[PDB]
Amino acid sequence: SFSGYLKLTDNVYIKNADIVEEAKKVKPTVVVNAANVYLKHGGGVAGALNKATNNAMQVESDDYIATNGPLKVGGSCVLSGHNLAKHCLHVVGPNVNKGEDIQLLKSAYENFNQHEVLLAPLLSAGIFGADPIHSLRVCVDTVRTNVYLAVFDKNLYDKLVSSFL
Numbered sequence: 001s002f003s004g005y006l007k008l009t010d011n012v013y014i015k016n017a018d019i020v021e022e023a024k025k026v027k028p029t030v031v032v033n034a035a036n037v038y039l040k041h042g043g044g045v046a047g048a049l050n051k052a053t054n055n056a057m058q059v060e061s062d063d064y065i066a067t068n069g070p071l072k073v074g075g076s077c078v079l080s081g082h083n084l085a086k087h088c089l090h091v092v093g094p095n096v097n098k099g100e101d102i103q104l105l106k107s108a109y110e111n112f113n114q115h116e117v118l119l120a121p122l123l124s125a126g127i128f129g130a131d132p133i134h135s136l137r138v139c140v141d142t143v144r145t146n147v148y149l150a151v152f153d154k155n156l157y158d159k160l161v162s163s164f165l
């Protein structure tokens with residue numbers, strides 16, 4: 001199972017790790033992708049997860065969008081986890097760099113509650129532009145299922161742990 005995580009709460013755990021490497025190692029039931037409404041996995045966590053699938057995630061995602069249309073900001077869909085996990089839960093957190101409402105971050109994290117255990121990044125963090133300290137607080141106050149957070153940046157991981165209330 002998951003190794004080397006620091007326990008933050010009864011159900012939230014955190015580790016300084018590359019989520020692709022973490023997924024390839026653990027092969028969790030669910031890996032969360034920091035998706036956008038179009039499932040265009042260009043950069044950030046989405047670009048990295050997609051590249052690890054040799055673009056199979058993008059091919060599957062384009063078929064999903066052609067059939068269903070775009071996701072809502074705060075919404076999600078379950079697709080294959082390919083070589084990373086049994087499933088990938090593509091969750092759309094608000095992108096404050098595209099002027100999206102930060103209030104949607106709680107709705108985005110609520111998607112995690114449909115899965116008993118997940119390997120995930122901090123939603124809306126990184127290139128999505130939100131404060132990762134705020135994202136972690138919304139995560140621990142919203143998610144009730146077991147979430148293993150992978151934070152790529154060591155300096156950000158240290159800041160998150162040292163400022164965790």
Ligand SMILES: CS(=O)(=O)NCC1CCNCC1
Pocket residue numbers: 001002026027028029030117118
């Ligand atoms: C760690 S998890 O609860 O996400 N998955 C359970 C098993 C162990 C890891 N490989 C898949 C089977």
